[model samples]
Structure formats: structure tokens, C-alpha cells
Target: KVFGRCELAAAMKRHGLDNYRGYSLGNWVCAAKFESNFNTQATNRNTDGSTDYGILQINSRWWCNDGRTPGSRNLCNIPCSALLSSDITASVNCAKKIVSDGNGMNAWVAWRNRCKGTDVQAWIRGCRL
Candidate 1:
């Protein structure tokens, strides 16, 4: 739980994510809302026996090690549990790396299915930085 969408936008900007990978802040905001409602402790179990970690819902299959899975790509090299922290530093870095290595925000399924092509401007409407 953050102060609000405005605060989240400010935090991202503070983290230098305002223009990450040439994508707008609104896109990230939208994805964040749908992914975990901006809750850091968010986690979900998938039918594939894999779990999604943290606010971004990063998968344990290829992104991070959850201790329950072996041979995880663990590209971030941090425990998947690390992403569930309020700090968000590891999650942000990993998310940027994942997006940079792929076709933009498509790395997030939530973005692809929900935020994509959607007018997300409302996410930051009337918010002053």
C-alpha cells in the first residue's frame, strides 16, 4: 500500500523509471495496479506449480529463485522473496532488465493483457509531482 497512484508515480520517477525503456510512466502505473494493486507482499500460486512473486508478479520459472524450484534462471540472482519487500529496489532492477531483454513491457503478462493499448492516463490524473 502506497500513498496513492500519485505517490507511486513519484517513487518510480525517483527511481529513474519515468522513461524506462522509452515507455511512459502511465503504462507502468497501469501494470502496477493490475499486477498487485501496488502491494509489495502480493504473491500468487499458478496452476503450473510455479508461483508469481511480488508486486510485478514475476515468475519463479525464469526470473527468480523461490527455493521451491530448482534450475531457475534467477536472472536477478535475488530470491523471489526479495521482491516482496517494500524497498522495491531489486524488483525494479529485475523488471527493467527483463523488459530491456525482451519486447518492452511485454515481459509482464498483466501489461500485455490489460494495460496494453488501454488509455492509462487516468492512473496519474490530477496528481502533482
Candidate 2:
């Protein structure tokens, strides 16, 4: 397990999270909830033979390599296991890079499918800093 939702919000704030690359922290937090429920060790195997890792569910097909997916892009060049830690520095950094690539949070299907154009401010309601 990792930080609670409130704690995660505070930590993300301290880590300089805002509308990163036009992606709101509220959306980010909500996406994380659906993706991993804030459990850093979470992993899910997609039906397409790719796996999602950690809180944001970074994909093995492009973000990281865990040997399960062949011909991976491995864009972040970090082991997928690194994302599965209570300390989310690496995960946040990698996510930022992903956001910077002009995909915004749309890079995360979870965010698109769960949080897009929705009132996700609930994710950070009492957690606001």
C-alpha cells in the first residue's frame, strides 16, 4: 500500500503538481484511484497482452519494460517495478514526461475513460492544500 488519497494529494502538491502539461492534479488523483486505488504495488494485465504498472498504471508496451511485453518502447527506461513503491518520485517524474509529450493525461486511458470532462474535483476535496 501507498499513501492514502489525502496524503497522496498533499504529497503531489509538495512535489509541485498542478495543471501539469494541462492535466489537472484532480484528474490525476482520480485516475490513480481507478488505476490502483493508491496501492503502489498494484499491477494489472491488459487483455491486449500488455501490463499496467503501479499507481498510474504505466504500460509495459511503451512506458516500461518487464520482459512480459516484447519489442517494448521502454520510453522511460526505468524498470516497471520502480513504480511500485510508496515513494512516488520516479513515478511522478515519468508521468510528467508523459504529460509533456503533448498527449496530456490522455496518454492514460484510465484518465480518459474515467475522468475526462468530469467533475473530478472530488478527488481532492478535503485534501486540498
Candidate 3:
């Protein structure tokens, strides 16, 4: 149940939140359903000795690497590489840090804003925003 995009959507839906206007970033449901199928256990490995962990495919090595002390960019203190960690709650919280202002949908909204007209297919093909 690690909060991937879909999980974030569910949280929004549960809280009676509305999607942002004319934008998909605020569309929590799309992120939730598409990113990881709401699967908290999703992960991807990298050659950097790190991993993309959990539903959001968050990179543990980049965000919370144990060997290299953490900073604003690297937020965790555990031995997690984005690949190692798979806790649903942890992933959700991780993603929440980025999209907190837009109620956890900032990334996607920003995505839509940035790439909409420039790249039509990449922008609107999978969009529900």
C-alpha cells in the first residue's frame, strides 16, 4: 500500500478533494492508477547502486542513500536505495514531499503545464487531468 500515484489519488478521493482545473497534475487518480497499479512493491534497479522503490518508482539511492549522508535532495536516513524500500506509507510520504502544495499532485500538474502543447502525445495521451 505504499502510496504510489494511485494511492495518492485514493487519499485525495477519500478526503473529498477535487481535481485541479484544466490540469492533470491535480488528477491524483491518474497518477495512482498508471504509475504503479497502486502496487507498493514496485521497484527498479540502477547501476548507481541505488534503486527506484515503491509505487512512485522513487529512487531510494538518490533520495535516501545510506553511504552518502542525506541532504534536502536526499531525505532519508535508512539504508534504503529507492530500490530497496517498498513500504507503501513511506513511498506515499516520500511523494507527498514534492506535491504537498497541490495536495500531492503537483508533479503531474507541473508535467502537464510543461509539456502539454509542446508534446501533444506525450502530454495528453495518458492524461485524465
List, residue by residue over 21-127, the lDDT tens digit for candidate 2: 76667887898898888888999998878899898898898888888898789899999999898898878888888888887888888889989989988889987
Ranking the candidates on lDDT from highest down gives: 2, 1, 3
Backbone clashes in model 3: 15
lDDT of 2 at 95: 88
Which 10-residue window in model 3 sums to the lowest lDDT?
118-127
Report the lDDT tens digits of candidate 1 across residue range 1-129. 443678877777677777799888888888888998988788998877778887688888788999886566888888998989878787788888888986899988889999989897778788786
Better of 1 and 3 by TM-score: 1
Quantify all predictions' global Cα lDDT against the true fold.
0.82, 0.85, 0.47
Candidate 1, superposed: residue stretches over 4 Å from native: 1-3
RMSD of 2: 1.4
Ranking by TM-score: 1, 2, 3
- Once all C-alphas are superposed, what RMSD does model 1 give against the true structure? 1.4
The estimated TM-scores of all candidates read: 0.92, 0.91, 0.46
Q: Write the per-residue lDDT of candidate 3 for residues 65-95, one digit (tens) a residue.
A: 5454333246644344443344344554565
Model 1 TM-score is: 0.92
